[PDB]
Design an enzyme around this catalytic site. Structure first.
Site, PDB file in Angstrom:
ATOM      1  N   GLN A  67       0.890  -1.176  -0.118  1.00 30.15           N
ATOM      2  CA  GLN A  67       0.061   0.022  -0.115  1.00 30.15           C
ATOM      3  C   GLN A  67       0.813   1.052  -0.229  1.00 30.15           C
ATOM      4  O   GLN A  67       2.326   1.048   0.245  1.00 30.15           O
ATOM      5  CB  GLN A  67      -0.899   0.000   1.123  1.00 30.15           C
ATOM      6  CG  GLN A  67      -2.219  -0.815   1.042  1.00 30.15           C
ATOM      7  CD  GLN A  67      -2.816  -1.176   2.250  1.00 30.15           C
ATOM      8  OE1 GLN A  67      -3.927  -0.833   2.559  1.00 30.15           O
ATOM      9  NE2 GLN A  67      -2.186  -1.946   3.197  1.00 30.15           N
ATOM     10  N   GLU A  68       0.154   2.380  -0.252  1.00 30.11           N
ATOM     11  CA  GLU A  68       0.770   3.875  -0.187  1.00 30.11           C
ATOM     12  C   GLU A  68       1.872   3.800  -0.994  1.00 30.11           C
ATOM     13  O   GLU A  68       2.958   4.533  -0.312  1.00 30.11           O
ATOM     14  CB  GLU A  68       0.856   4.397   1.141  1.00 30.11           C
ATOM     15  CG  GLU A  68      -0.532   4.840   1.767  1.00 30.11           C
ATOM     16  CD  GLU A  68      -1.428   6.017   1.253  1.00 30.11           C
ATOM     17  OE1 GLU A  68      -0.995   6.673   0.644  1.00 30.11           O
ATOM     18  OE2 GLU A  68      -2.465   5.962   2.032  1.00 30.11           O
ATOM     19  N   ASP A  69       2.165   3.110  -2.147  1.00 27.01           N
ATOM     20  CA  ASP A  69       3.474   3.089  -3.023  1.00 27.01           C
ATOM     21  C   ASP A  69       4.483   2.302  -2.389  1.00 27.01           C
ATOM     22  O   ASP A  69       5.703   2.251  -2.934  1.00 27.01           O
ATOM     23  CB  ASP A  69       3.883   4.517  -3.401  1.00 27.01           C
ATOM     24  CG  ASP A  69       3.193   5.168  -4.060  1.00 27.01           C
ATOM     25  OD1 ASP A  69       2.504   4.903  -4.890  1.00 27.01           O
ATOM     26  OD2 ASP A  69       2.702   6.228  -3.693  1.00 27.01           O
ATOM     27  N   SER A  70       4.395   1.105  -1.766  1.00 35.34           N
ATOM     28  CA  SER A  70       5.185   0.212  -1.490  1.00 35.34           C
ATOM     29  C   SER A  70       5.285  -1.090  -2.455  1.00 35.34           C
ATOM     30  O   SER A  70       4.119  -0.906  -3.456  1.00 35.34           O
ATOM     31  CB  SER A  70       4.671  -0.821  -0.090  1.00 35.34           C
ATOM     32  OG  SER A  70       5.235   0.057   1.084  1.00 35.34           O
TER      33      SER A  70
END
Ligand SMILES: [Zn+2]
Ligand SMILES: [Zn+2]
Ligand SMILES: [Zn+2]
Lengths: 137, 230, 49, 147, 56, 65, 119, 228, 56
Positions: free
Chosen positions: C2-5
């Site tokens: 999530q959130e750019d991982s």
RNA sequence: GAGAGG
DNA sequence: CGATCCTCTCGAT
């Protein structure tokens, strides 16, 4: 036919012609080559002459190294990069020692050379010569 | 951009001499009320004189640059409505090559100067790795243009998709407007050439929100590969 | 992720995926000046040092 | 607008023209200086009808003649009489103002000064256009009606 | 753009992207979108240093 | 820089297939897709391994030292 | 306005009233030259200007490849070969009106349905 | 080519739009006040109003533009010859000083030589024409963001700046050595290190740094990937 | 959908005609400007609305 | 000082 | 006299 109009695919043949001739850094090379071939002589011939010491033709050697307790020899970029040297050529001009009589040659310094320009060794180097000179083709 | 170059610089003096030799009244001898429809002639921001029949002068000037008699990097701009001929030989001008478009058989009715025959010669030279970029240039098939000259010209975006003739569609394909202007002087070599090194790596940037292409342009320089073989 | 991982496969990493060499060059020279005074490349011990 | 009375689209248009700063420059097409020496006989054939009138219910041979725009005069809440009486209530006695009717095809205002005369008129025209409030409030450039 | 004729106020001429990112943008459309795009990055860069000073 | 041994994704040994692939392309004058299939590179993870490989080692071996 | 110069000086002629005969004369202040006025119009301002709308209409106009070409018929000759533009008057409150130049006549005609024109 | 004296000439239209008596004054280098245009033309040898206006207005029927120039003609009325026009600018010795500025300082491109006046007066008039065209709302203000009007300086032009500077220093060093010889020793190191310093640092102003030429001309060259 | 696309395509062509009609009208000196704004400002405002409407 | 990262 | 924060790396005096 040879007179038939070109299509959109045909544009890449032209694009390959460009680049095969220019490469990708032509602006860099064209500017420097102009400076060496024309501009350099023009700067030397401006205010130049004195009260009488005149400045004639300028010569730009291929890049060389003045070795401390040694002779001068060809400096290639891989040797410059490794030994922290400046890949530069010597500037030599014709100086006339004109002495008044009724009225009434000389080393100037070292010019850093742009890699792959006319005065640079690599400009005329073949693929096998580049690998020999430890330079990427 | 991929195909843009910068002017190196040329001595304007032979052009000036040629202008005074191929018409051109000197400024000292100019009397406006008796030469009312005269084009003002500028060489590198210097107004040298005036000319009556700039149409012939301009045809002569372009023919020479296309032969190579005038250096291909020299730019010559005719402003018909402003009664001005501006020529620049100076360095620093960012220019790009374009295909020349010209009338063929019938005065109308333009065609690119490069024909399949030229392309065949180009590719013959490619297979022996004779007919180079300089061949296209010296034969005046292609030509260099800077922003100042860009102002006086009409460029088609595609050879075919911009100039064959008019007389079904793929719903999947993007929408393209049309000819809607058919007074072309030039044609783009290939629109993807509007892009520089980094953006030239992006697959389908025409399918991306613009700032994402700017972002990719930055990161491509932070991506490790094989920087040099040595 | 999530959130750019992102989730990367360890097994493919074991096989070499996105593995890289890293090089760093360190430089030195024996002095800048001193007619008699010269720095020396050697393995240093005591000698008051 | 007034608590009444704020639904009245007409009352709004009126307050708009009452407050929007209107100068002479905003209504004028062109201004001209002619040499019309006889004050009761025109050199300009269009103006003939104006001179027939303006006698009942000394000057200068130089005429300052302004042509006004019919549409601009209608965008603003202006009549020739208003524009004319406003020019009249500036120089009062030191300038003589005549004008064409509101129905009269071309909108014209004719002015005269009541040695070294030629420059004085060109000076007056500047004040006429730039420094004269026809109607409105100073600093209030554009007024727009909004629902 | 030098691909248009003078005095052309049409949608295509002044930056109207008819196509979707799926269909793909034409060069004219592509350039104009890049122009619009740039204005965004320029003020992003300003509406950070300016707001930072406000905040202080 | 030399054929990876084993496909990153599945583990199929690919390091024994490079020379055979070059031969399939050159000598047999086959297309890349049929060359890959003849090698038994059925899935696309194994196919990208070989088709996408750039053999810089040849370039490196050119340096005289 | 349309102004004149001293036939000999080439300097601007300044106005002067007779007073006795009520006539306008133009006098030179570099010498003694004096001619009469051709028109009483000594000055003109113009705030709503039409001048420069059609500017750049040169015989070589058709040879401008950037100028658009309409399907309009020239009211004079009936040629459908024309070039066109909007007002060359680079002012904010200018009309969207088109001006066409017949590439066979040199005739300038407009898209304007309201105003006429005299050019 | 040959030095690089950048003198900026400003032809200014005084008086606001709506202010009667709008005058045109030009700015000259080393000249205190702004000179009313008519006085410049007369100093160049263009005396009659008609000739001065012919050098500006290129169409007789453009009364609009000629009406714009009527206050200039009036502003210059008091000067009716070259000698007095040159005199107005900037004893006797001052007339020469004024004549000198017109050839050396005023419009240095065109020419910096003696007999050219007609060339300079026409160009000066071309600038007034251009100024009025915009002032009369026939032309848009010039777009200072047009790429055609911009030049990109590369290696050549940049080195040519330094090599001019360093070669003049070498020329100066030789003259001094020659002067001392009141009764072969050329400092080669001058160029060698000067060129090295500029390329070695960003500092493109000969060990001074004072000028924003330091900006980042010459950077250590990116080698992360081939593309970079 | 194929049909949705067709409807989208026609939605844009009708917007394209609105802009043409307004243009043709502006060029005929029939378009009257509202108090407070230019004929050209009025035109630009209309064109942009038609064009935004179309995207929406 | 420049190049970069969020 | 103001002109985001913090973080990194580099080269050169
Ligand atoms: Zn696999
Ligand atoms: Zn006279
Ligand atoms: Zn006709």
């Amino acid at each position: 036919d040879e007179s038939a109009p070109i299509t959109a695919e045909d544009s890449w043949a032209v694009i390959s012609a460009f680049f095969r001739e220019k490469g990708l850094v032509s602006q860099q090379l064209d500017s420097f080559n102009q400076f060496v071939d024309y501009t350099l002589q023009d700067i030397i011939c401006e205010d130049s002459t004195l009260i009488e010491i005149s400045f004639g033709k300028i010569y730009v050697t291929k890049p060389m190294v003045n070795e401390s307790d040694g002779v001068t020899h060809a400096l290639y970029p891989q040797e410059a990069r490794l030994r922290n040297l400046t890949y530069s050529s010597g500037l030599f001009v014709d100086v006339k020692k004109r002495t008044y009589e009724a009225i009434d040659k000389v080393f100037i310094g070292r010019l850093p050379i742009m890699l792959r320009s006319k005065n640079c060794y690599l400009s005329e180097a073949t693929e096998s010569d580049l690998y020999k000179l430890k330079e990427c083709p | 951009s991929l195909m843009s170059c910068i002017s190196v610089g040329t001595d304007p003096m032979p052009i000036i001499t040629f202008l005074s030799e191929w018409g051109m009244e000197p400024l000292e001898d100019y009397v406006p009320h008796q030469s009312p429809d005269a084009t003002r002639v500028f060489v590198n921001g210097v107004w040298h004189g005036v000319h009556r029949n700039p149409a012939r002068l301009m045809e002569t000037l372009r023919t020479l640059r296309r032969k190579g008699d005038i250096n291909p990097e020299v730019s010559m701009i005719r402003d018909i409505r402003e009664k001005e001929l501006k020529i620049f030989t100076d360095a620093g001008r960012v220019y790009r090559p374009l295909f020349i478009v010209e009338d063929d058989e019938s005065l109308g009715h333009k065609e690119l100067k490069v024909r399949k025959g030229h392309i065949a010669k180009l590719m013959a030279t490619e297979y022996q790795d004779e007919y180079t970029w300089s061949s296209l240039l010296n034969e005046g098939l292609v030509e260099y243009i800077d922003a100042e000259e860009e102002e006086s010209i009409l460029i088609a975006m595609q050879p075919e998709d911009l100039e064959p003739a008019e007389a079904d569609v793929d719903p999947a394909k993007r929408i393209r407007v049309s000819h809607h202007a058919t007074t072309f002087t030039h044609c783009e070599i290939h629109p993807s050439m509007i892009l520089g090194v980094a953006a030239s790596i992006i697959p389908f940037p025409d399918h991306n929100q613009s700032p994402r292409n700017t972002y990719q342009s930055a990161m491509g320089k932070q991506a490790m590969g094989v920087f040099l073989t040595n | 992720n999530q959130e750019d991982s992102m989730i990367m496969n360890q097994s493919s990493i074991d096989r070499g995926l996105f593995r890289s060499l890293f090089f760093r060059s360190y430089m030195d020279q024996e002095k800048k000046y001193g007619m008699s005074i010269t720095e020396t490349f050697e393995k240093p011990q005591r000698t008051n040092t | 607008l007034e608590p009444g009375h704020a639904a009245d689209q007409e009352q709004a248009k009126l307050i708009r023209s009452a407050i929007e700063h209107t100068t002479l420059k905003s209504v004028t097409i062109a201004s001209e200086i002619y040499y019309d020496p006889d004050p009761r006989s025109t050199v300009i054939p269009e103006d003939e009808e104006i001179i027939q009138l303006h006698f009942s219910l000394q000057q200068s041979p130089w005429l300052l003649r302004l042509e006004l725009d019919r549409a601009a005069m209608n965008d603003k809440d202006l009549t020739m009489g208003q524009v004319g009486e406003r020019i009249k209530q500036t120089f009062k006695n030191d300038l003589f103002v005549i004008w064409s009717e509101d129905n009269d095809e071309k909108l014209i205002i004719r002015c005269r000064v009541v040695a070294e005369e030629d420059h004085m008129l060109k000076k007056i025209e500047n004040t006429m256009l730039e420094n004269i409030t026809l109607r409105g409030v100073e600093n209030i450039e554009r007024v727009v009606m909004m629902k | 753009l030098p691909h248009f004729s003078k005095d052309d106020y049409s949608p295509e001429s002044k930056g109207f992207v008819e196509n979707s990112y799926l269909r793909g943008l034409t060069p004219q459309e592509f350039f104009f979108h890049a122009m619009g795009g740039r204005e965004g990055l320029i003020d992003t860069a300003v509406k950070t240093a300016e707001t930072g000073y406000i905040q202080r | 820089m030399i054929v990876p041994v084993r496909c990153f994704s599945c583990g199929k040994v690919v390091g024994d297939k490079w020379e055979s692939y070059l031969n399939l392309l050159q000598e047999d004058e086959l297309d890349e897709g049929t060359a890959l299939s003849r090698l038994g590179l059925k899935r696309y993870c194994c196919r990208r391994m070989i088709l996408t490989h750039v053999d810089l080692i040849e370039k490196f071996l050119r340096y005289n030292p | 306005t349309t102004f004149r110069f001293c036939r000999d000086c080439n300097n601007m002629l300044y106005p002067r009233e007779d007073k006795e005969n009520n006539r306008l004369l133009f006098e030179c202040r570099t010498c003694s030259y004096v001619e009469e006025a051709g028109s009483p119009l000594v000055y003109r301002h113009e705030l709503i200007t039409n001048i420069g709308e059609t500017a750049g209409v040169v015989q070589d106009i058709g040879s401008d490849p950037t100028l658009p070409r309409s399907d309009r018929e020239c009211p004079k000759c009936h040629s459908r070969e024309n070039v066109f533009f909007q007002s060359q008057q680079r002012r904010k409150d200018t009309s969207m009106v088109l001006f066409f130049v017949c590439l066979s006549c040199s005739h300038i005609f407009t898209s304007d349905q309201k105003n006429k024109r005299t050019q | 080519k040959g030095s690089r004296f950048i003198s900026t000439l400003q032809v200014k239209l005084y008086g606001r739009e709506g202010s009667s008596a709008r005058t045109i004054k030009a700015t000259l280098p080393y000249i205190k006040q702004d000179i009313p245009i008519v006085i410049i033309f007369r100093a160049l040898g263009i005396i009659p109003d008609g000739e001065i206006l012919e050098h500006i207005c290129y169409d007789v029927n453009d009364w609009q533009m000629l009406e714009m120039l009527k206050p200039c003609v009036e502003d210059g009325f008091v000067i009716q010859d070259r000698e007095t026009a040159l005199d107005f600018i900037g004893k006797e010795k001052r007339i020469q000083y004024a004549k000198d500025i017109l050839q050396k300082e005023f419009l240095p491109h065109i020419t910096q030589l003696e007999g050219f006046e007609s060339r300079k007066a026409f160009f000066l008039g071309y600038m007034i024409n251009r100024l009025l065209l915009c002032a009369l709302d026939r032309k848009d203000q010039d777009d200072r963001d047009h790429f055609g009007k911009k030049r990109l300086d590369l290696a050549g032009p940049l080195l040519a700046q330094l090599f001019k500077t360093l070669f003049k220093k070498l020329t100066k060093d030789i003259f001094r050595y020659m002067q001392r010889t009141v009764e072969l020793a050329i400092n080669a190191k001058t160029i060698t290190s000067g060129l090295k310093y500029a390329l070695a640092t960003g500092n493109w102003g000969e060990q001074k740094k004072a000028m924003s030429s330091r900006a980042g001309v010459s950077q250590v060259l990116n080698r992360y990937t081939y593309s970079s | 959908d194929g049909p949705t696309m067709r409807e989208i395509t026609e939605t844009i062509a009708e917007a394209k005609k609105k802009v043409l009609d307004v243009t043709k009208e502006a060029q005929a000196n029939l378009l009257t400007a509202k108090h407070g704004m230019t004929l050209r400002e009025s035109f630009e405002d209309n064109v942009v609305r038609f064009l935004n409407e179309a995207r929406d």
